[PDB]
Structure 1
Amino acid sequence: FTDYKVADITLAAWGRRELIIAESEMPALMGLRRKYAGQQPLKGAKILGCIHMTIQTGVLIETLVALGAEVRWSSCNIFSTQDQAAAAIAAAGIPVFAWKGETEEEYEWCIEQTILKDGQPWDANMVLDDGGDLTEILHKKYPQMLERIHGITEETTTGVHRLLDMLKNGTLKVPAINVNDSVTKSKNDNKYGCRHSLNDAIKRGTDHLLSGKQALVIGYGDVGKGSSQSLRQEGMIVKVAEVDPICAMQACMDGFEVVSPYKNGINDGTEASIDAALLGKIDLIVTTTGNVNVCDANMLKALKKRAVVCNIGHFDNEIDTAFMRKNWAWEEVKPQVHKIHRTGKDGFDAHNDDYLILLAEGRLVNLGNATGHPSRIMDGSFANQVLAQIHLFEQKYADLPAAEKAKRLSVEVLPKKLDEEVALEMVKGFGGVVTQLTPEQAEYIGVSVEGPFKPDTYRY
């Protein structure tokens, strides 16, 4: 077996030890493996996967394989691979093209190695994506391959936005499931995973005390809520920026001061518009938005000396790293930790006081400087991914006639009953005990004893 590319195949035994521990932390996902093993619901499935090649993704891959799938795998970020996970999957005879510290060229080459087998399009029929890079490449460069693909299961908020844009423009060629918007994904992974992994990544990259220090979190969606808690629980003094007044109201009620980097919130492109007093007091800035240039050049110029800058949103463009690359000298501390010298770019003084510390070159910090979300949280996301793969593979959209395709070409979420069954396995993994409604109580609140327990309008 040679159909792979990883950093070091000799890490496979370490990877396999970690996979065995992870299996014990992922009861929803291992429950699906155990339930659906007999039935082989993914027999015949040929899955192109593009998602962070971590130990958790390993347990997802081997679940899909155990249910009958074949896969070809790549990471959706240049720094998110755990090399021992990539090695364990390669050593199991699974095609994977992933290492930590890819270049942009190696990243694209790795996605192309999943799409192509022996130099020709693989007989793919399913797509599992995180952030939409693989989905975009298939639509733009391999439209013939999409004729035989039954669906896309999309992990993250940014990738779902890209799918919905394609659906509105009539360019989406196969149906998708929005896995992000299961409650056991969005209100589990996006929030609690960032609570666990943001402070973890800053401590591994810098070993900085956080207690006592001033943080600014840009955004207060699911990731900004979990990020703000990651920092506040360590004793940081956390300020929150938002454009959405409903998310800002939650931040105030959660005990955060809501501030804007710009005077009166107005970003009119000038240095004069920067709240220099506020940014001059900030020791850490974290972007959580999925948006573009929310930590801009003028903010970076105004930050306190030796402030840490990082991004936990899907793509680097949240921070104006291109400005920093043009203007300022980069001194590498160790991989995924750079001192950015604001003195200029004509080399640097090792003793200069005027620098920022950038983590993961502005790429997803939790995965770049630590290991991303823990197994027990990713259990929820990846149980949903498996149920979504089963649903779209069983629906066989590619085999429908043209007029039947038209009725099914949609971006859909999984039913609440499945979201509840995932949650129940998660709860039992903590040793939680869920109460069973009496018939009197089920009748009183108007639900089945078996659920679903809430209307689809319920926000949790």
Structure 2
Amino acid sequence: GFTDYKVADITLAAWGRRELIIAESEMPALMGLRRKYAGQQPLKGAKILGCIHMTIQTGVLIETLVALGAEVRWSSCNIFSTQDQAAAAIAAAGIPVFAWKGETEEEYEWCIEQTILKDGQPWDANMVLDDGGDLTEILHKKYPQMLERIHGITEETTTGVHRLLDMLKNGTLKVPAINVNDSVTKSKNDNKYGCRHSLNDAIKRGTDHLLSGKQALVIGYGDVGKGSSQSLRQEGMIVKVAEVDPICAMQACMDGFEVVSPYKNGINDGTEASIDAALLGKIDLIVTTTGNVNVCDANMLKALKKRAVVCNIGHFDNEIDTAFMRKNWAWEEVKPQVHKIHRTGKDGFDAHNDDYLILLAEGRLVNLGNATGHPSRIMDGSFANQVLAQIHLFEQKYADLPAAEKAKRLSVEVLPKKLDEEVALEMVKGFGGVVTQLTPKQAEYIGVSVEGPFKPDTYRY
């Protein structure tokens, strides 16, 4: 008689459950934590508000937290990223989840609100797991009294960490947080290799376009930009890379990419004259990866080669000026998450017009919107970190401390390197890899313990 959920189609549960069982076999770090901590129940009494893409991989995360003793209430952090079979399997297990693929913005906020409210009143939540900071922001702005009982936030992604650090700098962050993004087994695994796997996957599913031999422009060359450029280059695209950070641009050059700017001499002065129209007129695919605002702007969209594909793999859709396209150009839906944007005008469209762009996922995160996001064996690292971070902040019991004790603990921290290494070891063993053990003499020679950690905290990998 469980009704405390909202999903697209509960009859997808058995399919979702089959995929969860496969995903468990692909997630040895996460399932190792389930086995290790199940007897101890370290999350007994935890009540976790979770806001992260309701995929099969998030399902394994949810059920690990529950297996460790937690209660949860769950929503997705993006309108297109839910896998409806994953949501159904979680709801069928008696877990409150409010998520479906293809929400409206109003439905998106309503879903988050259904996690925060139980029976019309604030749930007695005491932990937060977030991806991008939307739940964290709603709590601080609209439900500040609830933060009086919450011990911590564990934040998944680069954009969400930025938002937390802004709150900390401004003195508005109310509970301590763990930056899960910056574990090496997250940032340099999920952010990079996850996008390598799933960017070309999403473009193929949405368009079935041949990529070999065509010209791509990747805006950004951080972790997501690195993985995205490789996703395209390994398919045979001719990839050009734009960057504002000269160190990242240096890496792009050494990795074998030509570094270009959409703007003449790199100067974005707001005029059409500043656009390198020759460059943009040759691009078949543009991908934004920055976490910044308006990096694929209206003048760039006007200058792109006819029939170019436009997509964003950063957290928020404002990387592309889709608002300009909504105001000026006609949208022809090809299928869900695939639209032809007719640059002829806004008053209907000609089904045979040759002057259109193909926009994927309406500019929302394309790997999750047009495919299934990162694969389970990659998300294993990110979500093992999430579980460890939830255990730590819940055990620390910040909400129970005296006000003086709270002041010294109000921070944004990362996990210790030793735990990062232990997650990595389980990942390596999952591939069948065999890590060598240092001899006592070798450990002494390089100045480390045989057990690790093996690198100083300054090490960049």
Q: Distance in 2 between matches of 1:341 and 1:116?
A: 42
Q: Distance in 2 between matches of 1:429 and 1:273?
A: 50
Q: Distance in 2 between matches of 1:355 and 1:66?
A: 50
Gaps of 5+ in 2: none
SS at match of 1:42: coil
Q: 1:413 offset after TM fit, Å? A: 0.1
Q: 1:368 offset after TM fit, Å? A: 0.1
Q: 1:277 offset after TM fit, Å? A: 0.1
Q: 1:198 offset after TM fit, Å? A: 0.1
Task: Encode CA deviations 1:357-395: one digit per residue, 9 max, x unaligned.
Answer: 000000000000000000000000000000000000000
Q: Distance in 1 between matches of 2:352 and 2:142?
A: 49
1:21 alignment counterpart: 22
Paired residues in the alignment total 460
Q: Distance in 2 between matches of 1:18 and 1:34?
A: 20
Q: Distance in 1 between matches of 2:155 and 2:167?
A: 13
Q: 1:51 offset after TM fit, Å? A: 0.0
Task: Encode CA deviations 1:79-114: one digit per residue, 9 max, x unaligned.
Answer: 000000000000000000000000000000000000
1:330 alignment counterpart: 331
Q: 1:302 offset after TM fit, Å? A: 0.1
Q: 1:204 offset after TM fit, Å? A: 0.1
Q: 1:218 offset after TM fit, Å? A: 0.0
1:300 alignment counterpart: 301
SS at match of 2:7: coil
2:42 alignment counterpart: 41
SS at match of 2:273: coil
1:423 alignment counterpart: 424
Q: Distance in 2 between matches of 1:135 and 1:443?
A: 45
Task: Encode CA deviations 1:21-55: one digit per residue, 9 max, x unaligned.
Answer: 00000000000000000000000000000000000
Q: 1:309 offset after TM fit, Å? A: 0.1
Task: Encode CA deviations 1:144-171: one digit per residue, 9 max, x unaligned.
Answer: 0000000000000000000000000000
1:201 alignment counterpart: 202
Q: Distance in 2 between matches of 1:223 and 1:133?
A: 20
Q: Distance in 1 between matches of 2:404 and 2:232?
A: 52
1:445 alignment counterpart: 446
1:339 alignment counterpart: 340
Task: Encode CA deviations 1:281-336: one digit per residue, 9 max, x unaligned.
Answer: 00000000000000000000000000000000000000000000000000000000
Identical positions, percent: 100
1:221 alignment counterpart: 222
Q: Distance in 2 between matches of 1:140 and 1:22?
A: 36
1:220-239 map, 5 Å: 220-239=221-240
Q: 1:77 offset after TM fit, Å? A: 0.1
2:254 alignment counterpart: 253
RMSD: 0.1
Task: Encode CA deviations 1:229-248: one digit per residue, 9 max, x unaligned.
Answer: 00000000000000000000
Task: Encode CA deviations 1:124-145: one digit per residue, 9 max, x unaligned.
Answer: 0000000000000000000100
Q: Distance in 1 between matches of 2:319 and 2:144?
A: 30
TM-score, normalising length: structure 2? 1.00
Tell me if 1:73 matches 2:52. no
Q: 1:276 offset after TM fit, Å? A: 0.1
Task: Encode CA deviations 1:197-216: one digit per residue, 9 max, x unaligned.
Answer: 00000000000000000000
1:138 alignment counterpart: 139
Task: Encode CA deviations 1:381-428: one digit per residue, 9 max, x unaligned.
Answer: 000000000000000000000000000000000000000000000000
Q: Distance in 2 between matches of 1:394 and 1:379?
A: 23
1:280 alignment counterpart: 281
Q: Distance in 2 between matches of 1:222 and 1:163?
A: 19
Q: 1:173 offset after TM fit, Å? A: 0.1
Q: Distance in 1 between matches of 2:167 and 2:393?
A: 18
SS at match of 1:239: strand
Q: Distance in 2 between matches of 1:422 and 1:59?
A: 16
SS at match of 2:291: coil
Q: Distance in 1 between matches of 2:133 and 2:443?
A: 42
Q: Distance in 2 between matches of 1:329 and 1:295?
A: 19
Q: 1:222 offset after TM fit, Å? A: 0.1
SS at match of 1:272: helix
SS at match of 1:85: helix
Q: 1:63 offset after TM fit, Å? A: 0.0
Q: Distance in 2 between matches of 1:368 and 1:308?
A: 15
Q: 1:184 offset after TM fit, Å? A: 0.1
Task: Encode CA deviations 1:2-31: one digit per residue, 9 max, x unaligned.
Answer: 000000000000000000000000000000
Q: 1:275 offset after TM fit, Å? A: 0.1
2:87 alignment counterpart: 86
Q: Distance in 2 between matches of 1:208 and 1:71?
A: 40
- Runs of 4+ in structure 1 deviating by more than 2 angstroms, as ranges, are none
Task: Encode CA deviations 1:171-192: one digit per residue, 9 max, x unaligned.
Answer: 0000000000000000000000
Q: Distance in 2 between matches of 1:144 and 1:304?
A: 52
